[PDB]
Amino acid sequence: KQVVLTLWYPWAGPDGDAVVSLAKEYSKTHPNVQIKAQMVSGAGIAATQGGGQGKFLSAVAAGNPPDLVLYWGQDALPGLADQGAIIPLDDYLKDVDTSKFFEAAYNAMKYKGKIYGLPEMVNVRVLFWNKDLFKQAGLDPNTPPKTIAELDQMAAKLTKTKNGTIEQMGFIPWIGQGVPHVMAGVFGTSLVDSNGNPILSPDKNPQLLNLLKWEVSYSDKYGAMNINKFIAGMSQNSSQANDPFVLGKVAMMISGEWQINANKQYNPKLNFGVGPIPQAPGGKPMPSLMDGNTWMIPKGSKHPQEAMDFIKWTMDPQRIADTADKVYNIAPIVEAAKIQKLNNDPYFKEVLNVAQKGSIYYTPAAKGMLSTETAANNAFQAAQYKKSTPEQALKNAQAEAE
Numbered sequence: 003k004q005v006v007l008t009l010w011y012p013w014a015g016p017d018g019d020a021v022v023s024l025a026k027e028y029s030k031t032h033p034n035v036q037i038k039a040q041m042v043s044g045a046g047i048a049a050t051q052g053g054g055q056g057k058f059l060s061a062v063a064a065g066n067p068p069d070l071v072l073y074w075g076q077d078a079l080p081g082l083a084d085q086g087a088i089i090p091l092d093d094y095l096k097d098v099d100t101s102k103f104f105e106a107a108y109n110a111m112k113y114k115g116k117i118y119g120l121p122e123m124v125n126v127r128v129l130f131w132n133k134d135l136f137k138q139a140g141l142d143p144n145t146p147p148k149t150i151a152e153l154d155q156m157a158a159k160l161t162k163t164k165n166g167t168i169e170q171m172g173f174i175p176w177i178g179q180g181v182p183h184v185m186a187g188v189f190g191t192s193l194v195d196s197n198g199n200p201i202l203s204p205d206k207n208p209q210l211l212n213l214l215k216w217e218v219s220y221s222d223k224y225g226a227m228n229i230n231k232f233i234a235g236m237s238q239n240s241s242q243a244n245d246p247f248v249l250g251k252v253a254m255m256i257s258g259e260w261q262i263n264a265n266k267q268y269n270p271k272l273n274f275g276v277g278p279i280p281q282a283p284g285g286k287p288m289p290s291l292m293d294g295n296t297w298m299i300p301k302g303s304k305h306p307q308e309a310m311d312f313i314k315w316t317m318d319p320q321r322i323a324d325t326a327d328k329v330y331n332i333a334p335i336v337e338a339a340k341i342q343k344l345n346n347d348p349y350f351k352e353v354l355n356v357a358q359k360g361s362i363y364y365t366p367a368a369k370g371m372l373s374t375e376t377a378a379n380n381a382f383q384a385a386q387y388k389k390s391t392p393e394q395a396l397k398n399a400q401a402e403a404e
């Protein structure tokens with residue numbers, strides 16, 4: 003076709019299918035535009051444990067990057083913008099009524115006086131629990147823990163061992179969305195300061211150490227190697243048919259609202275609750291990170307106007323409401339969110355209450371966020387694996403982040 007537009011999206015499965023379907027329908031109905039949709043994990047943008055690198059930044063350097071990317075968060079935009087790896091959208095957007103977007107979602111697109119993306123979906127973090135497993139412990143299946151202390155107590159009651167072998171875990175702090183850049187906010191702290199500089203060491207961020215020591219209390223109590231053997235093969239930090247909650251192997255898990263989708267599709271018999279994350283010592287009641295997916299146009303995009311035209315088409319209120327319902331996300335346009343069919347879904351109503359009544363926090367906007375995340379991620383893993391003390395792991399992380 004006249005315009006061949008390459009799109010990168012960041013996950014396979016149902017979410018991937020939804021994006022592929024959007025691209026396919028647009029292409030079918032537009033004789034002069036074809037969209038080649040390609041799944042590259044984390045859009046090649048997400049922080050990885052590898053040697054820095056990154057498939058997106060590599061593609062930008064190589065000179066033929068995708069014309070459009072869909073990334074799964076709001077944490078990467080400042081760094082990509084500062085590097086000049088994505089183009090400003092201000093002229094494309096000047097005559098677009100951006101008041102239609104949720105304020106917080108659109109505000110995250112702003113960096114150094116320019117606009118560098120558009121919100122594709124809005125996400126929040128919640129607690130999932132297995133009601134059948136609660137009943138087996140003599141816990142009220144309709145009442146989740148309100149504090150981390152309560153969570154820890156319930157978790158012990160919900161852990162099963164047979165002849166020394168773990169058969170069921172009550173809770174594993176670091177799986178699902180229990181990642182450092184989420185849990186920091188739950189504990190009322192951050193990975194960076196007001197200037198965007200890393201605050202990872204115990205002497206720079208005592209509360210971060212508190213969080214890590216709490217996580218490691220699980221490693222010490224249940225056994226680090228035991229936990230790792232128990233969850234071997236399972237999807238540790240993404241919603242899948244084989245994530246530990248869907249498999250019924252962990253009784254409670256912190257995840258995104260989207261997790262409802264995986265639960266329903268892959269384990270229809272799974273009897274689960276959805277509710278607020280329990281309050282941490284030093285954190286606010288019912289904490290939740292509000293973020294979302296982000297469209298960006300890479301530096302090197304051959305077809306920025308056509309990319310923008312496709313985005314606009316995906317943003318049709320009914321269309322995006324339908325997309326949001328399909329993937330169990332919150333539509334990023336206020337009008338669309340209000341008409342979503344999931345407004346009448348029992349699980350999603352709990353999600354909307356979190357969005358409306360929870361103590362909402364946001365990822366800080368920092369150009370070095372992703373490298374700071376990598377340093378924090380490595381430290382948390384090292385401590386969980388007992389390769390370092392939590393204290394030394396975080397000291398090491400500070401040096402790496404700097």
Ligand SMILES: OC[C@H]1O[C@@H](O[C@H]2[C@H](O)[C@H](O)[C@H](O)O[C@@H]2CO)[C@@H](O)[C@@H](O)[C@@H]1O
Pocket residue numbers: 013017073074075123125239240241258260294295329330331
């Ligand atoms: O799993 C589909 C949802 O993915 C979300 O992004 C996740 C990503 O899958 C992974 O788990 C990573 O560790 O965290 C991301 C959130 O920060 C969102 O893209 C959501 O919209 C999808 O429905």
